[PDB]
Design a protein around this ligand. Structure first.
Ligand code: CA
Ligand code: CA
Ligand code: CA
Ligand code: CA
Ligand code: ZN
Ligand code: ZN
Length: 160
């Protein structure tokens, strides 16, 4: 009788399929690892980076129509999107490479912050109505801690 789209295994894998040319590959790797670690700390879930098309969460940079019927829209506007837990395209996270990806300081959008938000979706979270929460549906650059009680409550409601 229990519902919520969620992963039914606790060790989730992820594959960085390609790379934006806006940042060094190591910096991109580290941004995604940091975004997963945000979630990992407060949940029984683990995240394992793999090199495999068969990862749970496939990560892809793309522009305009990129093969899922949810085209990106050029600069600004939509930044990224992610599908809820499930097989194949489900669980995957895509980033609009018509954006300038950075660490959010000076110019462009923080790849770390956007990815942390997308990974919330990829793990089954919807949007928050709390302006301060990571899952609030608007980008605000911050240097400080992104998680709010509401984000932690949401993920723990799903996974314990
Ligand atoms: Ca964990
Ligand atoms: Ca865009
Ligand atoms: Ca997937
Ligand atoms: Ca870009
Ligand atoms: Zn997409
Ligand atoms: Zn969102």
């Amino acid at each position: 009788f229990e519902g919520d789209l969620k992963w039914h295994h606790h060790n989730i894998t992820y594959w960085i399929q390609n790379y934006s040319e806006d940042l060094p590959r190591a910096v991109i790797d580290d941004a995604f690892a940091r975004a997963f670690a945000l979630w990992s700390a407060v949940t029984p879930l683990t995240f394992t980076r793999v090199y495999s098309r068969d990862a749970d969460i496939v990560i892809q940079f793309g522009v305009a129509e990129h093969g899922d019927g949810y085209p990106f829209d050029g600069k600004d506007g939509l930044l990224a999107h992610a599908f809820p837990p499930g097989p194949g395209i489900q669980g995957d996270a895509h980033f609009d490479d018509d954006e300038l990806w950075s660490l959010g300081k000076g110019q462009g959008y923080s790849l770390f912050l956007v990815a942390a938000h997308q990974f919330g979706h990829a793990l089954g979270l919807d949007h928050s109505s709390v302006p301060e929460a990571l899952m609030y549906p608007m980008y605000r650059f911050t240097e400080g801690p992104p998680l709010h009680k509401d984000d932690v409550n949401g993920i723990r409601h799903l996974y314990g």
